[PDB]
Amino acid sequence: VDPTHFEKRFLKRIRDLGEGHFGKVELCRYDPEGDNTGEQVAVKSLKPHIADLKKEIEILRNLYHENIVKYKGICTGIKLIMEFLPSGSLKEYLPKNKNKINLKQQLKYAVQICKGMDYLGSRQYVHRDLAARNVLVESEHQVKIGDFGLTKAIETDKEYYTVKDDRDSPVFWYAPECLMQSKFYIASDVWSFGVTLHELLTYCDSDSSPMALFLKMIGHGQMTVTRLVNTLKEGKRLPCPPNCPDEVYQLMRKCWEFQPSNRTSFQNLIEGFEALLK
């Protein structure tokens, strides 16, 4: 018996957890005994791209870290089976738990995101989609990177992976090199982390989301990106979140050096946050 093989006959759908343009995540119970005592699992599938999900499955099957959602197996199109985190993403969790998640907890979540991302980069992968919606909450004390749908392998001795396609990109989390040349470096993930940190510090408030704040700064869906690149070239950046200490904001700003080669590393962020937590 292969513990990573989930038979369709016993994989029972319970309800939706979330959905995108092409992907879907559902809560299921894998219930071979048929009495509703089986383990609950999160199941990612595609809406009725298949090659992409097979690549994501193989990436996650080979990642093992406390701040990366656990791979459990497959159901064979194909479905990806993972552990289930009932608290969902930071985007759903933070607005409902502000009283519980103070600055000290926010900085510990920032450390955990950095550790999971640093592990990913050590494996020569660039995530390309780091945002609060992709950070899952295990508990009030732990977060995990929870999706790898856009993840690419950077070739050995190369510094970036080039992605040119017709798909909708999270442009308000993208570094200048991603917007201008579709080049993704590990440092491009650091830029996205700075935006995710801003979301975490604003408790994922929609009125002060990266998209809302950049749209206020820039003033059509087709001219948006050029005005965003120009704003970044001018040295403009997302403002300090409400009640965020300047020392935290300065670490966030080091994520957003214009050139990828000047940005902080994830390990330097971890050390900076650990110094503030002491």
Ligand SMILES: COc1ccc(Cl)cc1-c1nn(C)cc1NC(=O)c1cncc2cn(C)nc12
């Ligand atoms: C990262 O989240 C997503 C990624 C991709 C897509 Cl199509 C949707 C979501 C998502 N949206 N919402 C509202 C809630 C989501 N997920 C979960 O609650 C979830 C829970 N436990 C383990 C999970 C593993 N994954 C991939 N997702 C997991």
